[PDB]
């Protein structure tokens, strides 16, 4: 009672992963992302795969 019209809007947001987001495995090893490192700065193997 008392309402004449209702308008409902659905908004879709694509949320990317950023520092501060909480990431975890399946063994209780939770964590918070501290840095999004550049590719060239991360450890890599002999074949070159970082």
């Amino acid at each position: 009672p008392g309402v004449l019209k209702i308008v409902k809007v659905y908004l879709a947001v694509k949320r990317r992963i950023q520092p501060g987001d909480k990431m975890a495995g399946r063994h209780g090893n939770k964590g918070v992302i501290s840095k999004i490192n550049p590719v060239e700065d991360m450890p890599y193997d002999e074949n070159g795969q970082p």
């Binding site: 009672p1 309402v3 950023q18 520092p19 501060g20 939770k30 918070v32 992302i33 501290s34 840095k35």
Partner: protein, 1202 residues
């Protein structure tokens, strides 16, 4: 504006003076116009206009007509806010008794006319009669007359007597009372009587009567005739959404009261039968009681939601009440909150603040700067640029932030390091970047914790944040003085890996010119980081007198230690680095850097240590793997042998050689020794390796395993976790506390089966549940400690006293638990410290013990020293600087005007979550008790002397035989008497036996004056005295736990202080927590605030009452200066809960807990709170008398002195 807050009874004249009108009808708002109606609960005449500078009828509807009352509507044209300050009143048809004044035990109506509460309530629910005016009859005042009995009384006297009924009867009984003559009746009755119960009741009633006469309150006001009505916005009736309304239960309660009063008036008009009028009066009393305090008089009135209504009392009290939810803890503006990440590039004084939070929090500052540089003409333009996120707004933000500290907080705030000031560095993202070195202060780890951000605004707040709250100034723990910025985890692992020694490494035996050469060698891949070399080290020693002596020698070290020498500041030895560096070694580095260099060098060194540790932990490549858990080959053999021996004892139980309990306690020992041997074998296998040296020989080396390095470095890990990793998990406890006979023989590397995992869960669940309950209990304990110690402020520099406490090294057998140097570090001496066996004054009076004098006192080997203590301080309010000594978080003497009690309470309560005759030394022996003293003056061993190889003075060599922590801490601090107190000797004298009367035993003590004091003794007591023996005061009569009360009564202040100090410190030290004794001493001083007067003297105090000790000191000093005889007292020990509720100020006591009785006592006695404490000044919103606000209050006191 105001200096104190008086409390008292509200007379009907005062209630009428407060009110702007009389509420007559229960209507709240109209259902069509939604406007207040006339003389209702929301009336616009009584309480004021609804809209600002308007009126209900709209005739005067602008500001020009201010202060003018409409003739049509009667509403004064003013602001709406006056509706939160205007009061009303209801003229009750019949008097109604106040519920607080009747059921806040003891009842102050029952105990003011000497009548029990059952009788009084029989009169109030209209069940009996009571005589007011006996006249010339046989009856007297206060006599019960039953209804039929009252008919007979009316028959044979009639009009001679008045026998009323209800609250009116109470009112005119209290009218007929004459307090002066009745107090004199007390005074003459007390001396004649002998019984203790009658005397105690008599003095209680005399105290209440004298309070009434002194305060000026009348007992008539004890019963309400006019009922005040609260402002409407404090009980709002507002439209939530779409015609739905939200109200307060006060509206319902007031509506009931108004409706029933109107019904009573109507019944009185119609001359209704007596039963209906009586029932109406009964409901009026019930409704007023439910309005004032619901759920106390009877069953709680419930609303339409089948939940009890909330009354006035229920919202001035409780955890969800006004005090604790809105006056002590407030939601604040200029605040934010975000997830915390780690910034390894930050400095100690820097924290990473997102630009969105900085923009939203610093918005007024941005507006100010935009206007002052003219980019925005007005505030609207500035808001437009800020919202549009223009480029120049970011430069303005980076100019506002430049030198503006920001306060970071984490919940819970267990100690004062939980809020710290940082300089913000603005960053992209939405997470706050925190310096790692402060995480240990916050108890913060990055698995999802959030922190709150506060922006100080005024200049004083900014200076306080930069000078007091900066993370750079906060590097020492206020609990113990140890550094709190010590590195952990990755830093320790990196510095440990860098400072390790490897045998036959690349570049071994090279000679290096210095640290720079070693860095050059490692960067060129010539010498390994763990290569032994000889390095020319230049080293400066800064002596205690300030001598800077430089020297240069060639030291055998490694490359890593040579590099780490680069970041070590000048003034430190190289022996601090020339070793593998675990957590303790790095802590010692920081400690000595602070001790010999100061604060700036220490903070720069801490930063550089952090960067070096991070860099070399990164370069090290420490990784945990599955081959790192080397399970020893002896584990399987030991398990097999244990199984064989358990089967052997299993076929020996049927032989009857052992019992079931013996079998249990033998299998438990079998497995609990197999566990120790497996753990030792694993540690031996894991901590050693065999390498080839340069010559070619096989040499033993300390292992470079990842798990071993993690455990040995102290970064994170311990021996028990390794033993559960690669050894045996061990025996486990059943949910009842019993231990399962068959242990878990498998580790986590090889996995467990289903039963072992179930048994492990049995203990995991207990651990979690106990963590939760521990957090709750620790929080409650900390709150009680803060509420008892909140009034302790350093108010003077020297109290000019000569008393003190003696201190010696703590001995609990043949070994030292803690030395005198640790105990006396930072405590001002009380008497001159003489050289042992000499009259030389080694340490003069009134000196503070730093590390230099600690070295002196260790070298000259003195055992007992007298130092000043907070308990022995003579300051009237608070303590003095010298009696407290060194501020642990600052390193110097305590400043005037800081809250040491709050610091003590936080220090004691923070570690609550962590709380769960052979001779060996050469020397002489002595009898005191038994003592064993070494060659020097130090007494190495101390043992009790029971009721004998050597006598006194006989030299003894080594080997010559002579022959639930938290509940305990809370128990000690509340001074709870034990279940079975140990009887002590009240008076010194000779023991003599009496007559074993029925029930229990009796004894007597014969004094030196011939007095025979009778002592009540339970039969089961194992008496330790023999008749004909002269025992001393305080001697133990029966063995058992000792209550603190009788130690205080029969031994003294120092005895109880020492008892509490070490019996709390034993709980803390058993768990590994270091808390200085000054904190416990401060709590004890607060626990000894009260004294009972025994001799009246020339003072005004009546013997038999409790008074504050400081008041007695003031009175006794004045009486001594006047020459008249002083007053004699006994000092009493109160728990941390009773002492807080017994404070002079009633606002602090009401805010703590137990609000109803505190307010009742304060109102009846008519107390005055002078606002001389932290909590009252917090509640009223003015400066606290501590810290930066100390001097200000002093000036006011000066302005109150003139």
């Amino acid at each position: 504006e105001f200096d104190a807050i008086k409390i008292g009874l509200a007379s009907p004249d005062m209630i009428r003076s407060w009110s702007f009108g009389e509420v007559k009808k229960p209507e709240t708002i109209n259902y069509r116009t939604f406007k207040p109606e006339r003389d209702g609960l929301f009336c616009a005449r009584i309480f004021g206009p609804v809209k600002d500078y308007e009126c209900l009828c709209g005739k005067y509807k602008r500001l020009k007509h201010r202060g003018v009352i409409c003739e049509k509507c009667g509403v004064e044209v003013t602001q709406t806010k006056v509706r939160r300050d205007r009061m009303g009143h209801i003229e009750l048809a019949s008097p109604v008794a106040h519920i607080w004044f009747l059921k806040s035990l003891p009842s102050r109506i029952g105990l003011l006319m000497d009548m029990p509460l059952r009788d009084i309530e029989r009169v109030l629910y209209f069940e009996m009669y009571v005589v007011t005016e006996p006249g010339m009859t046989d009856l007297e005042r206060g006599q019960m007359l039953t209804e039929e009995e009252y008919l007979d009384r009316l028959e044979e006297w009639g009009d001679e007597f008045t026998a009323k009924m209800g609250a009116e009867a109470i009112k005119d009984l209290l009218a007929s009372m004459d307090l002066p003559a009745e107090a004199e009746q007390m005074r003459e009755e007390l001396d004649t009587t002998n019984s203790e119960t009658k005397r105690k009741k008599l003095t209680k009633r005399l105290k209440l009567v004298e309070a009434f006469v002194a305060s000026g309150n009348k007992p008539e006001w004890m019963i309400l005739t006019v009922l005040p009505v609260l402002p409407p916005d404090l009980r709002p009736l507002v439209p939530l959404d779409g015609g739905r309304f939200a109200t307060s239960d006060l509206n319902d309660l007031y509506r009931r009261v108004i409706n029933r009063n109107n019904r009573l008036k109507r019944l009185l008009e119609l001359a209704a039968p007596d039963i209906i009028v009586r029932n109406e009066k009964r409901m009026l009393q019930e409704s007023v009681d439910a309005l004032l305090d619901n759920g106390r008089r009877g069953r709680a009135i419930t609303g339409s939601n089948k939940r009890p209504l909330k009354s006035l009392a229920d919202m001035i009290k409780g955890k969800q009440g006004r005090f604790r939810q809105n006056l002590l803890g407030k939601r604040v503006d200029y605040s934010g909150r975000s997830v915390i990440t780690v910034g390894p590039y930050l400095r100690l004084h820097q924290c990473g603040l997102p630009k969105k939070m900085a923009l939203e929090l610093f918005k007024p500052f941005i507006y100010s700067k935009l206007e002052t540089r003219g980019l925005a003409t007005t505030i609207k333009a500035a808001k437009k640029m800020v919202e549009r996120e223009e480029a120049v707004v970011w430069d303005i933000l980076d100019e506002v932030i430049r030198e503006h500290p920001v306060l970071l907080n984490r919940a819970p705030t267990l100690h004062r390091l939980g809020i710290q000031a940082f300089e913000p560095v603005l960053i992209e993202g939405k997470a706050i970047q925190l310096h790692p070195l402060v995480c240990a202060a916050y108890n913060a780890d990055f698995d999802g914790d959030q922190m709150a951000v506060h922006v100080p605004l005024t200049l004083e707040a900014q200076l306080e944040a930069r000078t007091l709250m900066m993370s750079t100034n906060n590097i020492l723990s206020p609990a113990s003085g140890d550094p709190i910025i010590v590195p952990s985890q990755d830093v320790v692992l990196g510095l440990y890996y860098m400072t390790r020694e490897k045998i036959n490494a690349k570049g071994e035996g090279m000679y290096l010119t210095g640290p720079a050469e070693a860095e050059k060698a490692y960067r060129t891949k010539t010498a390994e980081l763990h290569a032994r070399v000889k390095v020319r080290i230049t080293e400066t020693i800064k002596h205690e007198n300030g001598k800077l002596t430089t020297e240069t020698k060639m030291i055998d070290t490694t490359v890593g230690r040579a590099m780490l020498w680069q970041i070590v500041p000048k003034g430190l030895p190289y022996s601090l680095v020339n070793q593998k560096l675990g957590k303790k070694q790095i802590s010692n580095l920081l400690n000595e850097a602070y001790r010999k260099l100061g604060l700036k060098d220490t903070v720069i060194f801490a930063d550089q240590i952090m960067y070096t540790g991070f860099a070399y932990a990164a370069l090290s490549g420490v990784s945990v793997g599955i081959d790192d858990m080397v399970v020893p080959a002896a584990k399987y053999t030991e398990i097999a042998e244990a199984e064989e021996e358990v089967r052997e004892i299993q076929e020996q139980f049927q032989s009857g050689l052992v019992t079931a309990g013996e079998r249990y306690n033998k299998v438990i020992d079998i497995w609990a020794s197999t566990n120790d041997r497996v753990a030792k074998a694993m540690m031996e296998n894991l901590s050693s390796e065999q390498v080839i040296n340069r010559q070619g020989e096989q040499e033993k080396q300390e292992s470079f395993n990842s798990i071993y390095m993690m455990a040995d470095s102290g970064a994170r890990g311990s021996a028990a976790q390794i033993r559960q990793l690669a050894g045996m998990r061990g025996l486990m406890a059943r949910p009842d506390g019993s231990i399962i006979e068959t242990p878990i023989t498998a580790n986590f590397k090889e996995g467990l089966n289903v039963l072992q995992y179930f048994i492990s869960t049995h203990g995991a669940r207990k651990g979690l549940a106990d963590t939760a309950l521990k957090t709750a209990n620790s929080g409650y304990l900390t709150r009680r400690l803060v509420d008892v110690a909140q009034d302790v402020v350093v108010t003077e520099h020297d109290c000019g006293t000569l008393e003190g406490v003696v201190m010696t090294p703590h001995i609990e057998g043949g070994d030292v638990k803690v030395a005198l140097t640790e105990l006396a570090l930072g405590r001002v001496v009380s008497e001159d410290i003489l050289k042992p066996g000499t009259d030389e004054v080694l340490i003069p009076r009134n000196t503070l013990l730093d590390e230099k004098w600690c070295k002196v006192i260790n070298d000259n080997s003195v055992d007992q020293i007298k130092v000043r203590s907070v308990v022995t301080c003579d300051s009237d309010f608070g303590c003095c600087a010298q009696c407290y000594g060194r501020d642990l978080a600052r390193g110097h003497l305590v400043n005037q005007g800081e809250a040491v009690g709050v610091i003590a309470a936080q220090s004691i309560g923070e570690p609550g979550t962590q709380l769960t005759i052979q001779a060996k030394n050469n020397g002489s022996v002595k009898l005191h008790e038994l003592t064993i003293i070494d060659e020097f003056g130090r007494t190495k061993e101390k043992h009790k002397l029971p009721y004998l190889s050597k006598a006194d003075g006989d030299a003894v060599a080594a080997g010559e035989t002579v022959a639930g922590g938290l509940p305990r801490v809370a128990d000690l601090f509340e001074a709870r008497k034990p279940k079975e107190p140990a009887i002590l000797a009240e008076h010194s004298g000779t023991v003599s036996f009496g007559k074993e009367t029925k029930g229990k035993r009796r004894l007597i003590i014969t004094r030196d004056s011939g007095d025979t004091y009778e002592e009540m003794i339970p039969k089961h007591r194992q008496l330790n005295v023999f008749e004909g023996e002269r025992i001393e005061r305080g001697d133990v009569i029966a063995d058992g736990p000792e209550s603190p009360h009788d130690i205080l009564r029969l031994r003294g202040i120092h005895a109880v202080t020492t008892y509490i100090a070490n019996e709390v410190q034993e709980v803390y030290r058993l768990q590994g927590v270091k808390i200085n004794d000054k904190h416990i001493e401060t709590i004890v001083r607060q626990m000894l605030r009260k004294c009972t007067i025994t001799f009246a003297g020339d003072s005004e105090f009546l013997p038999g009452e409790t008074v504050e000790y400081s008041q007695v000191k003031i009175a006794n000093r004045k009486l001594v200066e006047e020459g008249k005889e002083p007053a004699r007292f006994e000092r009493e020990l109160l728990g941390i809960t009773k002492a807080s509720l017994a404070t002079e100020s009633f606002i602090s006591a009401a805010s703590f807990q137990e609000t109803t009785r505190v307010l009742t006592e304060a109102a009846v006695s008519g107390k005055r709170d002078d606002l001389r404490g932290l909590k009252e000044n917090v509640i009223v919103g003015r400066l606290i008398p501590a810290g930066t606000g100390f001097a200000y209050h002093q000036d006011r006191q000066a302005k109150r002195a003139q």
